[PDB]
């Protein structure tokens, strides 16, 4: 049960960058995942959610229309394709796996990745 | 973000007329909808509400048993079928979208269509 | 119609045992099937599930990674490979067929096999 | 829930102060909203929960109140603010109802 | 969900009315099934969805209830109705779990 | 739903008792989670539903509460318990938010 991401780097503002997330050790096509930032000086913050099928997605109010999230169930991957970056997006992006729960309300994030640093600067 | 009505016209009393309402620019499957009439000389009046799935419907006491509201999430359309139209139903019918709220009590109507005129006369 | 299992016996703890379940009298490639235990002194307990295609499996929390359920549609059989057997697993194993249901929610186990006895002891 | 708006019609000039008062027959806590409708167009949401402002609406609009008394305040009337205004309620167990509306005319 | 059946063992004679009560620790809507297991055999489905009757079952068996309280009622006990009865649930997001099983014995 | 965690810095020695307080601006019922993030790593779940513990974590961690007041209790501080702890809420109709987090430092 291992979760690793990739696709980080440093890009100037206004460019498009695509992140990735590799899943192994568990059936990835059964779980809905998240992407979470950790900006130094602030706490965590949710970014996007994918609904186990690609049918439903939801975003933070500050990234709607710029960040798109999609997953390939065949390759066990997540993608957060980021467009039109700003300096406020300087953060570490994690993957989060939503824990199985015996209800209709979901659960907390049980498995977290290691994180890729994305920096936007001139 | 566009919400367009259609299907208006002129019918005789006792006939059946159905309306349509197309949503574009936003995900239609994630919002409940309302139909609101506007009779010249009177204010806004609620008619029916659809619960984001068709699972639950509620009608005004004046049109219960004659009005049917149903939605097609695959085509992003609304359907308010009027059966046994009367002269008092002469008004302009607007589609209303319930805005997102972070509670269990709902919120006001955010987006309104331009409305279509439906008149009943002999 | 009929549903008969086989492959039982007595094995030492830690050994590997393969069970079989031959189905006849109906189209076996149409139904998702289950394996159910019966430990004397305790009611029935669920073990695994096969999703009519082998695509999806779900196991009991106590047998995840030690039990492998797999099905062969061509020879009308089921298989439950049991690895790292323990003294707790002494129980009669049943096959179960999920009833046809006119919804997306499955149904109960209607056709049950006669059960095979698996004993683990030293 | 019978809902009334007063005054029916008020005359004001550009840059003036516009106050619209909405009453409810029964207490609705703070669950009340306001709408603005141009002639020949559809109404647009301005204030929700009777206190907060919907995103994109100019800050000139404001409102406050609780129970049965609710008011709308415009700091500086503009030429684009001449339209009919409605106040809507959505209580705990009461259906949505609207007032008769107040029309803003050029003085 | 943990399903507990009461009473654990009930004695009855031929033609007597028998009621078995099944309870769930969490709401399971109407998703519940009943089984009959004569000794030395494999259990047979009797009632699915807590109200419907499986094809081939006699009309004696009946069941009703919703949420957390379920009952099975046999209008007229028969000599072939003396077997262990189980209560299974299959909720929307919960796996299948079975009850302890009540045994009906001859008085 | 904005969360605040106090105290920001909690200095304690090995074997001491650690209590962390998380408060919510609006009631989150019992839907809450506690995390642990050692420096340079990814956070790990400790408590879900504010009362139950994640499988595999030591029974040392504990917590309870409902509504807007939550606590996380460590019976005896261990050498590997020095990390930053975050409070997360996931209410029914509200999105996931996290607190600023408190750090545990060697005394």
């Amino acid at each position: 049960v291992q979760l690793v991401e990739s696709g980080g780097g440093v890009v100037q503002p206004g460019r498009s960058l695509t992140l990735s997330c590799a899943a192994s050790g568990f059936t990835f096509s059964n779980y809905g995942m998240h992407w979470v930032r950790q900006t130094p000086g602030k706490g965590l913050a949710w970014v996007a959610i994918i609904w186990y099928d690609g049918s439903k997605t939801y975003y933070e109010d500050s990234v709607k229309g710029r960040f798109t999230i999609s997953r390939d169930n065949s390759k066990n991957t997540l993608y957060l394709q980021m467009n039109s970056l700003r300096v406020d997006d300087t953060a570490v992006y994690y993957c989060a796996r939503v824990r199985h729960s015996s209800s209709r309300h979901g659960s907390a994030f049980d498995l977290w990745g290691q994180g890729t640093l994305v920096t936007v600067s001139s | 973000v566009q919400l367009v009505e259609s299907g208006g016209g002129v019918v005789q009393p006792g006939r059946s007329l159905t309306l349509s309402c197309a949503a574009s620019g936003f995900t239609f499957s994630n919002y409940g909808m309302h139909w609101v009439r506007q009779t010249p000389g009177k204010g806004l009046a609620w008619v029916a509400i659809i619960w984001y799935d068709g699972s639950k419907t509620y009608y005004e006491d004046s049109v219960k048993g004659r009005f049917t509201i149903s939605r097609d999430n695959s085509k992003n359309t609304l359907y308010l079928q009027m059966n046994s139209l009367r002269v008092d139903d002469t008004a302009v019918y607007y589609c209303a979208r319930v805005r997102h709220s972070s509670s269990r009590h709902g919120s006001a109507f955010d987006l309104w269509g331009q409305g279509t005129l439906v008149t009943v006369s002999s | 119609v009929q549903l008969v299992e086989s492959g039982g016996g007595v094995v030492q703890p830690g050994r590997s045992l393969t069970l079989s379940c031959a189905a006849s009298g109906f189209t076996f490639s149409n139904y998702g099937m289950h394996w159910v235990r019966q430990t004397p002194g305790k009611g029935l307990a669920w073990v695994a599930i096969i999703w009519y295609d082998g695509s999806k499996t779900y196991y009991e929390d106590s047998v995840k990674g030690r039990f492998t359920i797999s099905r062969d549609n061509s020879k009308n059989t089921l298989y439950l490979q049991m690895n790292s057997l323990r003294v707790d697993d002494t129980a009669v194993y049943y096959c179960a067929r999920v009833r046809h249901s006119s919804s997306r929610h499955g149904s109960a186990f209607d056709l049950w096999g006669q059960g095979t006895l698996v004993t683990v002891s030293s | 829930i019978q809902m009334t708006q007063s005054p029916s019609t008020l005359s004001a000039s550009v840059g003036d102060r516009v106050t619209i008062t909405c009453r409810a027959s029964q207490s609705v806590s703070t669950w009340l909203a306001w709408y603005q409708q141009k002639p020949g167009q559809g109404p647009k949401l301005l204030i929700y929960e009777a206190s907060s402002l919907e995103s994109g609406v100019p800050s000139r609009f404001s409102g406050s109140g609780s129970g049965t008394e609710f008011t709308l305040t415009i700091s500086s009337l503009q030429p684009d603010d001449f339209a009919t205004y409605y106040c809507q309620q959505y209580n705990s167990y009461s259906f949505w109802t609207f007032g008769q509306g107040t029309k803003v005319e050029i003085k | 969900i943990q399903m507990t059946q009461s009473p654990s063992t009930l004695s009855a004679s031929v033609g007597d009315r028998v009621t078995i009560t099944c309870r769930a620790s969490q709401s399971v809507s109407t998703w519940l099934a009943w089984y009959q297991q004569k000794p030395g055999q494999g259990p047979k489905l009797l009632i699915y969805e807590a109200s419907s009757l499986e094809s081939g079952v006699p009309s004696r068996f009946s069941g009703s209830g919703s949420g957390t309280e379920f009952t099975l009622t046999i209008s007229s006990l028969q000599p072939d109705d003396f077997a262990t009865y189980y209560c299974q649930q299959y909720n929307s997001y919960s796996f299948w779990t079975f009850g302890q099983g009540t045994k009906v014995e001859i008085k | 739903i904005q969360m605040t965690q106090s105290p920001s810095t909690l200095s304690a020695s090995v074997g001491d008792r650690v209590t962390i307080t998380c408060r919510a601006s609006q009631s989150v019922s019992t839907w809450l989670a506690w995390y642990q993030q050692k420096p340079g790593q990814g956070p790990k779940l400790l408590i879900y539903e504010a009362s139950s513990l994640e499988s595999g974590v030591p029974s040392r961690f504990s917590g309870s509460g409902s509504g807007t007041e939550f606590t996380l209790t460590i019976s005896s501080l261990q050498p590997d318990d020095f990390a930053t702890y975050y409070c997360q809420q996931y209410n029914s109709y509200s999105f996931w938010t996290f607190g600023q987090g408190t750090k545990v430092e060697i005394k």
Binding site: S29, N30, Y31, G32, I49, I50, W51, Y52, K56, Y58, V98, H100, S101, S103, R104, H105, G106, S107 | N30, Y31, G32, I49, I50, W51, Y52, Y58, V98, S101, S103, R104, H105, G106 | I49, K56, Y58, H105, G106 | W31, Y90, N91, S92, Y93, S94, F95, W96 | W31, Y90, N91, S92, Y93, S94, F95, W96 | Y90, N91, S92, Y93, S94, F95, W96
Partner: peptide, 19 residues
């Protein structure tokens, strides 16, 4: 209860739904 948020409840269970 006519007045109840008719939206999607975004904080739902996004998992595999075994049943």
């Amino acid at each position: 209860d006519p007045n109840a948020n008719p939206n999607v409840d975004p904080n739902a269970n996004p998992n595999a739904n075994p049943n």
